[PDB]
Ligand binder design. Structure first.
Ligand SMILES: *[C@@H]1O[C@H](CO)[C@@H](O[C@@H]2O[C@H](CO)[C@@H](O)[C@H](O)[C@H]2NC(C)=O)[C@H](O)[C@H]1NC(C)=O
Ligand SMILES: *[C@@H]1O[C@H](CO)[C@@H](O[C@@H]2O[C@H](CO)[C@@H](O)[C@H](O)[C@H]2NC(C)=O)[C@H](O)[C@H]1NC(C)=O
Ligand SMILES: *[C@@H]1O[C@H](CO)[C@@H](O)[C@H](O)[C@H]1NC(C)=O
Ligand SMILES: *[C@@H]1O[C@H](CO)[C@@H](O)[C@H](O)[C@H]1NC(C)=O
Lengths: 98, 49, 196, 11, 49
């Protein structure tokens, strides 16, 4: 359940939508594919609730929680409503190896 | 030398011979292990040689 | 090959006597002449037929049009049995299309006759014993006889016997595989040498 | 052998 | 791009409903003791005209 709510001034979120690049990643790539190193990029995007913080349920089955499926690298695509200057950045990206 | 594909994808070499014993031939359009898309891992792309 | 005015009957391959079922066969008109066709089947005493859409008359079938009717069915006979259907064009029913000449070739009516094996109803369990006899200088004798009629359905029994020595039913491949010159340590050679 | 059973057990 | 139609008895037609299948093999499911070796399948149904 990747729990996601940051507020641009701590008390003012949008009634909107958010997705996020939950991706199975971490395999040193030349980007010969033209796409980055994702073994998977999953999209459990949801509309941001007007009332309250928005939370998401992402199942790790389709994530394929496998031995030779490697660490993740995560880079949200957080979009802003009726402004168009949509946000993107790679934070919470350097995870661990179990 | 340098040549370019006909409709069948063909060019027609011709090499004068009188030099060191062996000789290795390869014709190319794309470079030897290019720097962008080096490919040193799981990706699938290996251009013909 | 084609057939102009025919009934293409398709269905499962093998059925059972006990329970009932239905089948659905279709009459096929690849001709722009749009025909009302009165499909039926000629049922023998081997089975009884009861339809589900025979009270209503079919309407017509234009080029590649097809009128199909289902028929609940339960058989009583057994074995390699034949299967019956019917088909023919009809005259003077000007209600569906514009006209209906209704005259294919002299074999205009198509009456197909198709086969059927019908394995039986009930719980198929089995019975089997065996024995081995061999003298070298004389004779021996076996006797197997299994009377098992507990409250039975008749015409079920069947056996199919075997006088056999299964030394080499399909035993060629091991017999000319398992041959090697050994290699390695002592245990490696022992496995490479002992089966031989 | 091949044969059939179960005509009853409907009481 | 995909296309389908058969030569029938005498190459004729006959209509119906078609359900085309698209799936990848050797999926990512546990790799020694398979769970869902059929990949993320899709549905392209059609009406055979
Ligand atoms: C955390 O995950 C669980 C399991 O998915 C959530 O429980 C259910 O989640 C579904 C949506 O996937 C809801 O439709 C159900 O109403 C939830 N059932 C309940 C109340 O247990 C749980 O809601 C998730 N928590 C959050 C807010 O992320
Ligand atoms: C039902 O069909 C069977 C075949 O499944 C018919 O048996 C054949 O009869 C023809 C003569 O009409 C013989 O030439 C064949 O040799 C028979 N079978 C075969 C292939 O050996 C049977 O006559 C049909 N009618 C019955 C009795 O149901
Ligand atoms: C090829 O090179 C040799 C070198 O001795 C030369 O003699 C010859 O003229 C050249 N080509 C031909 C076949 O004319
Ligand atoms: C589909 O398109 C390809 C070109 O991308 C073409 O070569 C082929 O003939 C077309 N037909 C198929 C394969 O369905």
């Amino acid at each position: 359940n990747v729990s996601v709510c940051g507020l641009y001034t701590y008390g003012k979120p949008v009634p909107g939508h958010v997705t996020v690049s939950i991706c199975r990643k971490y395999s040193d790539a030349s980007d010969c594919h033209g796409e980055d190193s994702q073994a998977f990029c999953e999209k459990f995007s949801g509309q941001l609730n007007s009332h309250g913080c928005f939370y998401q349920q992402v199942k790790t089955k389709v994530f394929q929680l496998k031995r030779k499926e490697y660490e993740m690298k995560l880079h949200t695509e957080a979009q802003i409503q009726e402004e168009g200057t949509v946000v993107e950045l790679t934070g919470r990206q350097s995870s661990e190896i179990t | 030398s340098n040549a370019t594909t006909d409709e069948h994808g063909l060019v027609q070499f011709s090499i004068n011979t009188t030099n060191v014993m062996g000789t290795s031939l390869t014709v190319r359009v794309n470079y030897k292990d290019r720097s962008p898309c080096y490919g040193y891992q799981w990706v699938s792309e290996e251009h013909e040689e | 090959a084609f057939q102009p005015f025919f009934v293409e009957l398709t269905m499962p391959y093998s059925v059972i006597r006990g329970e009932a079922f239905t089948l659905k066969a279709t009459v096929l008109n690849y001709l722009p002449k749009c025909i009302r066709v009165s499909v039926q089947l000629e049922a023998s005493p081997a089975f009884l037929a009861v339809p589900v859409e025979k009270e209503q008359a079919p309407h017509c079938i234009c080029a590649n049009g097809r009128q199909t009717v289902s028929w609940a069915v339960t058989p009583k006979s057994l074995g390699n049995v034949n299967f019956t259907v019917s088909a023919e064009a009809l005259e003077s029913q000007e209600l569906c299309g514009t006209e209906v000449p209704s005259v294919p070739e002299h074999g205009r009516k198509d009456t197909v006759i198709k086969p059927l094996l019908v394995e039986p109803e009930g719980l198929e369990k089995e019975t089997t014993f065996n024995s081995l006899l061999c003298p070298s200088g004389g004779e021996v004798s076996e006797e197997l006889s299994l009377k098992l009629p507990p409250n039975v359905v008749e015409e079920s029994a069947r056996a199919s016997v075997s006088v056999l020595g299964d030394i080499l039913g399909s035993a060629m491949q091991n017999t000319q595989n398992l041959l090697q010159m050994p290699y390695g340590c002592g245990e490696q050679n022992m496995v490479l040498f002992a089966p031989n | 052998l091949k044969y059939n059973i179960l005509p009853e057990k409907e009481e």
